[PDB]
């Protein structure tokens, strides 16, 4: 699982000695997060499960 954007924090002060850590800027181009599960070794484990089911 990955999140490919490169964020950039920026702390905002909302009171006396307590801050709110915002997100100031995204460096680069914005790209959707995702996760990769190898289709071979996932279909094989689904086969195992369906056999035991």
């Amino acid at each position, epitope marked *: 699982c990955t999140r490919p954007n490169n*964020n*950039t*924090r*920026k*702390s*905002i*002060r909302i009171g006396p000695g307590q*801050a709110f*850590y*915002a997100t*100031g800027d995204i*460096i680069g181009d914005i790209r959707q997060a995702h996760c990769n599960v190898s289709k071979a070794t996932w279909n094989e484990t689904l086969g195992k499960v369906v056999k035991q089911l």
Partner: antibody
Amino acid sequence: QLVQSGAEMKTSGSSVRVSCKDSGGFFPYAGFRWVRQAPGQGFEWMGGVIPADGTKHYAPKFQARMKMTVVESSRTLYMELRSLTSTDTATYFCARLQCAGFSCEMDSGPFDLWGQGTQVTVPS
Amino acid sequence: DIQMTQSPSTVAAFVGGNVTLSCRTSQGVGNRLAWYQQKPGKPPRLLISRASNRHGGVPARFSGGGSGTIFTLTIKGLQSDDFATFFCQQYYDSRETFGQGSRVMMEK
């Protein structure tokens, strides 16, 4: 303002500890940088420490030589450079990332507040 | 990494004169580029952010331009307090690196 230790002189092999105390807070709000300037030629990134999350980020060159610490009680950054050399003579600055009002950068901005400098000379 | 080559190094100038620097990066930094100014002893003084946006306390005579890879800095009407060493900094990638300085002299 950030104020540093006085200019020092060390021997080839000894370890030098610079310091950087920031009078005015800004400790849990901004991210500080360690930058050294060789005599009369540009700058050279050397480290960076966000004291809010306590994340240090050493340059690849000075990755094994130095180590930087934070002391929240006295509000001071330390940069201890262990294996000195004749080529580590430089003016050492501690900076602070840009703060636009009350929202301070923590990760990447231009350095807007600098320290006075600590001229460390190591001849050999 | 990212390398900054400052084109005109140690360019002479006279008071009330034009002077144009140049900072050319190795790889594009968008507009994330700052311009510093250091007088021989003091620590640097940040002049410009975002390669065009001046700061509080910088005269209007300073001007940052360009974008992408080639950036400039133009001081239109010089004064006797502007002769220093100007550094350009990218803050795009993880570790911001500076140029090597480009002095401005006073020989008339």
